Design an enzyme around this catalytic site. Sequence first.
Site, PDB file in Angstrom:
ATOM      1  N   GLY A 286       0.831  -1.220   0.000  1.00  0.00           N
ATOM      2  CA  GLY A 286       0.000   0.000   0.000  1.00  0.00           C
ATOM      3  C   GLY A 286       0.854   1.254   0.000  1.00  0.00           C
ATOM      4  CG  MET A 288       8.728   1.790   1.977  1.00  0.00           C
ATOM      5  SD  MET A 288       8.564   0.839   3.507  1.00  0.00           S
ATOM      6  CE  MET A 288       9.965   1.468   4.428  1.00  0.00           C
ATOM      7  CD  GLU A 323       3.405   4.934   4.914  1.00  0.00           C
ATOM      8  OE1 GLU A 323       4.579   4.530   5.018  1.00  0.00           O
ATOM      9  OE2 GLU A 323       2.431   4.353   5.429  1.00  0.00           O
ATOM     10  CD  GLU A 345       4.212  -0.264  10.221  1.00  0.00           C
ATOM     11  OE1 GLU A 345       3.292   0.503   9.872  1.00  0.00           O
ATOM     12  OE2 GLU A 345       5.236  -0.463   9.539  1.00  0.00           O
TER      13      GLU A 345
HETATM   14 ZN   LIG Z   1       3.567   2.147   7.288  1.00  0.00          ZN
END
Ligand SMILES: [Zn+2]
EC number: 3.4.11.2
Lengths: 900, 901
Positions: A286, A288, A323, A345
Amino acid sequence: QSKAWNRYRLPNTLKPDSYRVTLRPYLTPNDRGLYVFKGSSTVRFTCKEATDVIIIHSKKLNYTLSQGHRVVLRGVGGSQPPDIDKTELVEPTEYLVVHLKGSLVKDSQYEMDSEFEGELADDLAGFYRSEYMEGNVRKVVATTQMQAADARKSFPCFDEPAMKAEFNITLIHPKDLTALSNMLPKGPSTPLPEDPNWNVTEFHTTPKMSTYLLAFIVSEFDYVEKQASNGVLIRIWARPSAIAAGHGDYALNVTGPILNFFAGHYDTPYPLPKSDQIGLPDFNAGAMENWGLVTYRENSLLFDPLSSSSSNKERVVTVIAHELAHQWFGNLVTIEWWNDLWLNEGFASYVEYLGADYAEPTWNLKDLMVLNDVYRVMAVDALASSHPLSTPASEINTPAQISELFDAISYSKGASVLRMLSSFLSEDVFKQGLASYLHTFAYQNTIYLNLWDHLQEAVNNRSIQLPTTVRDIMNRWTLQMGFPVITVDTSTGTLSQEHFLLDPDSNVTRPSEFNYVWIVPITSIRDGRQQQDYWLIDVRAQNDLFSTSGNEWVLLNLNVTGYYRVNYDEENWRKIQTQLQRDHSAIPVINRAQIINDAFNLASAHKVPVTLALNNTLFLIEERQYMPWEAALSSLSYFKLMFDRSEVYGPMKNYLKKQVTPLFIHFRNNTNNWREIPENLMDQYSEVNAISTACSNGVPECEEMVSGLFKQWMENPNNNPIHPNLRSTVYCNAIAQGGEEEWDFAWEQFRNATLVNEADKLRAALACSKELWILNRYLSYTLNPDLIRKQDATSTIISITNNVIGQGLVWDFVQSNWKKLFNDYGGGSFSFSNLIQAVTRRFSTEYELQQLEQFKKDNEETGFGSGTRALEQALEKTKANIKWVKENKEVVLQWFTENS
Amino acid sequence: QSKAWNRYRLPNTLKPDSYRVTLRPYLTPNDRGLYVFKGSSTVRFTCKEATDVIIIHSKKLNYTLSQGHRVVLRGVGGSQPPDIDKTELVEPTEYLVVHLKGSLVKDSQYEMDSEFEGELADDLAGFYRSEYMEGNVRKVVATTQMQAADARKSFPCFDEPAMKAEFNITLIHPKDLTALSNMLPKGPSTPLPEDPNWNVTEFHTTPKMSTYLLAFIVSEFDYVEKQASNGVLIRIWARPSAIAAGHGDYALNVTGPILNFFAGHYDTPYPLPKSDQIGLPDFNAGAMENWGLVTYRENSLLFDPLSSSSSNKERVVTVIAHELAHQWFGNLVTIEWWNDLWLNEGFASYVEYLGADYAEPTWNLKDLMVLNDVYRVMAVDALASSHPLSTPASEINTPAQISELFDAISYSKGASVLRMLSSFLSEDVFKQGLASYLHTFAYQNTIYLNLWDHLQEAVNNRSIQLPTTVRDIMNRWTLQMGFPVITVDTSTGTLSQEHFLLDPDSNVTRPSEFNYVWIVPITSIRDGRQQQDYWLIDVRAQNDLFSTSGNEWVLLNLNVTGYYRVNYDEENWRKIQTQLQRDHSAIPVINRAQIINDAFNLASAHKVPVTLALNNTLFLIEERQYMPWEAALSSLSYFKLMFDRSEVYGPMKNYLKKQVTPLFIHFRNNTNNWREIPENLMDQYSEVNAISTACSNGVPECEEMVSGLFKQWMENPNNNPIHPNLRSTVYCNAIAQGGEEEWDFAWEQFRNATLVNEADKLRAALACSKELWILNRYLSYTLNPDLIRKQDATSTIISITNNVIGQGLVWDFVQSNWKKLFNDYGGGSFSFSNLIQAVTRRFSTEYELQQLEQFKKDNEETGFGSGTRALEQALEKTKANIKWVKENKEVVLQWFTENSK
Ligand SMILES: [Zn+2]
Ligand SMILES: *[C@@H]1O[C@H](CO)[C@@H](O[C@@H]2O[C@H](CO)[C@@H](O[C@@H]3O[C@H](CO)[C@@H](O)[C@H](O)[C@@H]3O)[C@H](O)[C@H]2NC(C)=O)[C@H](O)[C@H]1NC(C)=O
Ligand SMILES: *[C@@H]1O[C@H](CO)[C@@H](O[C@@H]2O[C@H](CO)[C@@H](O[C@@H]3O[C@H](CO)[C@@H](O)[C@H](O)[C@@H]3O)[C@H](O)[C@H]2NC(C)=O)[C@H](O)[C@H]1NC(C)=O
Ligand SMILES: *[C@@H]1O[C@H](CO)[C@@H](O[C@@H]2O[C@H](CO)[C@@H](O)[C@H](O)[C@H]2NC(C)=O)[C@H](O)[C@H]1NC(C)=O
Ligand SMILES: *[C@@H]1O[C@H](CO)[C@@H](O[C@@H]2O[C@H](CO)[C@@H](O)[C@H](O)[C@H]2NC(C)=O)[C@H](O)[C@H]1NC(C)=O
Ligand SMILES: *[C@@H]1O[C@H](CO)[C@@H](O[C@@H]2O[C@H](CO)[C@@H](O)[C@H](O)[C@H]2NC(C)=O)[C@H](O)[C@H]1NC(C)=O
Ligand SMILES: *[C@@H]1O[C@H](CO)[C@@H](O[C@@H]2O[C@H](CO)[C@@H](O)[C@H](O)[C@H]2NC(C)=O)[C@H](O)[C@H]1NC(C)=O
Ligand SMILES: *[C@@H]1O[C@H](CO)[C@@H](O[C@@H]2O[C@H](CO)[C@@H](O)[C@H](O)[C@H]2NC(C)=O)[C@H](O)[C@H]1NC(C)=O
Ligand SMILES: *[C@@H]1O[C@H](CO)[C@@H](O)[C@H](O)[C@H]1NC(C)=O
Ligand SMILES: *[C@@H]1O[C@H](CO)[C@@H](O)[C@H](O)[C@H]1NC(C)=O
């Protein structure tokens, strides 16, 4: 195995300091049609402990023996270079063992030069290639996805998050293409001395990074840039055609605000000089968080205002925030080992909505977090197969174990727990501790305990009152799996806790410490006015706060901040129901959704009657918000799936139609006869829901309007009147309410489709037909690669399965053509797991279970492949479905009839 | 086994002479909540051959032990009764074997008194019960249905057609209710000595008859009576309300004349003083020809001129004719064994048209027979899984096989054979021979050979010229299954004959004494001008009668008289298509329908191109007669059943929509905006066909009109605006184009319906819904005996399986509840075969054949009983369907697409 090269963890004998990697990607196939890249790298490591062997991670690298060995060791600062005995490459543990004839003395830096050759394959790992069809011309781009490992594949390096070092990246690229990396270009691209066709671009040294975040992309993508007034140059790179259009404008318009918000929340200036977000056409991952060079899927960074739904607008703003948050937390302060992935995360997921909200304050995105993550993860966590958020670092070693850690729990569960952490710590104190954590541990790796300690230090300075130390109050929610269901006895004001399990008869084998008890922070509201606060320290506790009088309702988990479901005595439930009917405004919108969601889930554990759950759906007739309506429609989906082909469906539709009609009429007036979409994103979502459920249940006005809209498009094609947001709903209902003529028009548009989004919308809509012959014709088309792309074939068949009539067609199809489907599509192209899960989702009868069992034995010889581990799961779900229907059909049927 | 009881055939050692049955029906549930009838019977039997064991039929009867034995053997005429060794009840063969300690003196009459009790259930067999509701009070009527192996259930007896006897019936019934039996009551009902509330009514001794012709019915039904010219008193008995509403008026108007007509035609007087036609609310078979007390389903007897349709009127006259015909062919003269069942059913089916034509002379029902029977049986007869009209007796022994023989072959094929036989023997000669047969074998059992002998007598008496004896010519049509297809080479006028097989690869395992060859009688017309006839005695022959020149076209089997299919060469077919497009009137209406039916069936047998048959359907646009349209719709049904769930359905619907539109408009103008109805009966049928075909294909006006009419009926529930004849199509199409509200309105009206005809229409229409959940709910309703009567359970399921959406639902239901359906539901064996054929008429894929084979493998233990042959035939058809669709799917799709535009 008594050999460092046999061990999966790098020996702490030497630690890297600086890197110099010059890689030249050949984006043209050579002999044997192989895309390969040639690279030269050197690492100035420091001998921490005197040893005789140097171990560097290396994967799929041929290497070149400059002398008698693949690598050349040269001591720096007068350091004596020990002679190298031999060079070996270990595969089980991607290691480059270079045995040395002697010991490298400590406190002395040694540089190891290494020239190597690798393959630029389309593996979406390390240094990979991605070929997109710009017009009718194939265009290949060289991108990087070094998550977990993969960094080794690109170049010899200490591929471990703990090994932080400065990286000097230099790219030899064709003069026409442009080269991008984590940092800005040190100098303008100059023609390579030899073969002037190629240019050489060097980038400024990267701030001590930990690998895994390194990225070097060479392509012809154009870009839209904006100098933010904080010093960061925001550049959104994408396919030239899309950049030429306004597709990338929204991302550039939203990146600046999001960066500014995080800068304040993290109380730290953007670490890197600039932020480049690139939209790769494919990029299965999805997104980075490559420091400075964030890579996104083209669909998740570019927003075409003429063919993207408002849902896509939420997707881009939210993903950008996730991100961009990683740039401060996770890049500046990286995890010591992958075992603490949940903290990185999870935090990014939690602060994601916080940032997006700053960018779009009129959307209340933070509210959606619950339905999108909290309730989503709650479903998985409420199983005996759940795992604790924290895992022993020693346990995780193999790369596969690292990838396993990337579970939905690691993301949502972590975000939910961290949201609760901030709530009981007060955002201000939480931010204070976070700021200290980042500053004290800038450019270095850390463990989750470090954050707990800094938060506790902030707790002491602000003197906030916590029953126990932050560490202990958090260990309860991080070292044991599951979440507590708090039952409230309003009669005696008693509070109780238990490990919530959706299946009542579940053996929680996992031996959790603290015997599954949690220090639950409890926030409560009484008659609308919020009470003080309470912390459940033991299994059962009594407080006057939860005591109620003759007409007093108490509701816990305000805004469902804490990761715990709540159960109340039947009397409190009825009091809440009466309040919802007279004035739902008293209960916060988030908790209204909580009431419906919790009730249905509690009924599944058989803790409350199903009638109570449906009772909590009665107030929807007056509700005009999105969250509450969405929660009910999501929960009632199981009821529909189980009763869609039964008599109960009749009364069920009548009840839902009665509830939706008012909402539909409200929107019809608000949208001025379906002409102008509502402004708030939440309202836009509810409008789509209103039309969908109204037409599905059979509201007459809905089917009339959707039919008219499609007919207007049919009269004037090329100028679709249906607004992008309402396209999918109108398309499906119109095709369903229409005949072959409408399906034919839609099929023509699908074959002439130019944008994937529109094509997929039409593909799913074409499966909404109510004609058995049309659906069979569609199924025949699905297999044909020319008509339906093989990648989209599985989804199309699943969409036909969703059609009530299609269920039987697909079930016979899968039972009869399993051999063909598996043999011809043995590759990952066809996700048999999703296919079998969708075809067996409605199974609720012993006959269906017999058929599924027969299918299993009949095709036992031809392994179900991805289907295995899901076919057995489907069998278990089928058995549970049979019990649920035989235990709730009568009650549910009576409820709908009397309440419709 | 060698054991006589184990054998399913009654020993010939004992011959029944006369019986005395005294059944007492309890019309109130017992302590066990089960209606039970208690009765006693004595059989007078002559010992043809000395025997030490007495074997009689006993079914579901609990015999009260008397003198330590179920039966009591008494000597008649002073003969000594040997002591009873033991009495065993062999269930498999339903045999109460009375073992004796001595051998009955040969040629000595004996009597066996036996008391017994049995369940008066709703099994629609033996002495069953029929519960109807009057006002708010449940009313129970005990009736008897013993077509095959059910008289044994009512009383111990030699339940075989050959074992004829005189039966004395005494009915102990409630004083209020009235007892009805085959013969008139012998004196007034006398109060039961034990209870004055019960009455003891004995009836006059019945004449020599078979046990399956007995009827004992106790009911409170009222009646309308009218003496016929022959003097026989015709009385129509039915529910008090029905008789009061004049529903029996039409029945009384036709029964009398039809009965006299049959008597006059065969010069054989009816040998009973009265012939009561009674309508029972619960009855499996359409009607039973019980001598004196003919029983009918209310739908086949009751007729309300303001609610019943023209089709309903035809149904009543035809059914009454069929049953009255039996009074001669079946009751006066019975078959020796069920092997020659056609001798009764076939004749009664053929002469039924004669009686109906007499009563209704403005209908021309004999024209319909061509499509009603001849073509109907040709389809099943073609399968290599058929049976010879006169199947060897050895094959049919078990009662299941007995009930299985009641199929198109025994009825339609027999009637079609009689049609052809009468055509080439002339009606005068045919009826003369039949009269001799009836008079010679009155009160006696006969075989097929007996019939041929009397017919041959008439042939010689009238000096009729035949190729050979009637026996040899008709043995070809009776001793070998199937029918011949005549190939006409108009180029040389050569003819040939071969067994018509739907599957050219089908293996015929049944040997033929005549080696599959027939002395086919042939009648040919040239350009509409009839020529001389020819008999195709040999396999192949040539004649100028069939040889054509220039553009001359020859049509064989004028008015489909013979039982055979005509296969013309491409030349003749081209000329025929040329004639149809130029002036279809030239080709006989019946032959126009023959052309469409023959072309399609020949194509299905892979004998002619499929395009040829479809081409023959291009004259329909201008065709306005009913018979042509009817055959076309019926033949294209196979295409639908095979392509309804495929891509071809779309183009096919478009084509038909194009062909029916003109006819639909024509009738609209003719019926003045659908306000009036056509005067001619055939036109009325075609009008309904036009509306149904148009709405199904998608003609816009059709869907709008039917919906509007149903909507107006919803507005005025009591006043149904839809004309009775158009109700069937309108109801179905409306419900289909409607939703839950329409289905609910229909369900309520169905439950509140009064006339069975209207209820049947609503029930079938309810299955037209296009909502899977509604159809699933409906299927559950079918099983519930309270919501849908058990007699109509299979019919409703078949209607649901007819709906495309319902096909899958019913198939899974049949697979899931085979055991329940086979056990709980007896079906009277008349169904099951129908259900199997209905649920397996769309199978055209190997997976579907695999599922069917798995069904058989998983239900072999349960058994298929009457459906055994049907399931086996299904297998054959499924395999043929798989090959036909694979070889014709593309061409069929292309043709429709090109012609649809
Ligand atoms: Zn991530
Ligand atoms: C990646 O680039 C960095 C610079 O951005 C390189 O670090 C540099 O390393 C050289 C030695 O190789 C240093 O030179 C030294 O300078 C000092 C005076 O500052 C002098 O006393 C020494 O004799 C020597 O000449 C240089 O200063 C240093 N630059 C910085 C900014 O630290 C690094 O070596 C590169 N990567 C690799 C693997 O070589
Ligand atoms: C790869 O390197 C080549 C060669 O340096 C780049 O082409 C362009 O080369 C010329 C010099 O030969 C420079 O630009 C040119 O200079 C004139 C002024 O004399 C100026 O008006 C234009 O810009 C003209 O093109 C420059 O070095 C270089 N790039 C530019 C901006 O033109 C080529 O662009 C390089 N490719 C990439 C993607 O960096
Ligand atoms: C690096 O070495 C490996 C091992 O020799 C090479 O792998 C070979 O190349 C073929 C493709 O040409 C692969 O399919 C096989 O795994 C190997 N076969 C042979 C004949 O050795 C690899 O190609 C080399 N690296 C590059 C970039 O070419
Ligand atoms: C992105 O920003 C551009 C400007 O750089 C927007 O174009 C206009 O600018 C204002 C302020 O952003 C917008 O509100 C207006 O709608 C635009 N036109 C005018 C006349 O001001 C653009 O709309 C923004 N969004 C996208 C998706 O391009
Ligand atoms: C049935 O009824 C008859 C007539 O009442 C009983 O009488 C016998 O049948 C003949 C019929 O003509 C009488 O004439 C004789 O008196 C009887 N014959 C014999 C051989 O007894 C007859 O018994 C009854 N049926 C039974 C009991 O078998
Ligand atoms: C059955 O017969 C009755 C009596 O003949 C028919 O009713 C009508 O009776 C009136 C009395 O004045 C006569 O004028 C009519 O001619 C009779 N019509 C017919 C067609 O006969 C009745 O219609 C007949 N049929 C039905 C359906 O009961
Ligand atoms: C059936 O289709 C037509 C009659 O409708 C027959 O004739 C063909 O007509 C088409 C269209 O005009 C021509 O293109 C062909 O050339 C005609 N046929 C031939 C052989 O010339 C057609 O022959 C029929 N097909 C059959 C009986 O199989
Ligand atoms: C495909 O869509 C384009 C754009 O609307 C239109 O111009 C073109 O005619 C379409 N082509 C076909 C074959 O429908
Ligand atoms: C019953 O018997 C009585 C005489 O006891 C008689 O009057 C009455 O009509 C009989 N009822 C019937 C219908 O048989």
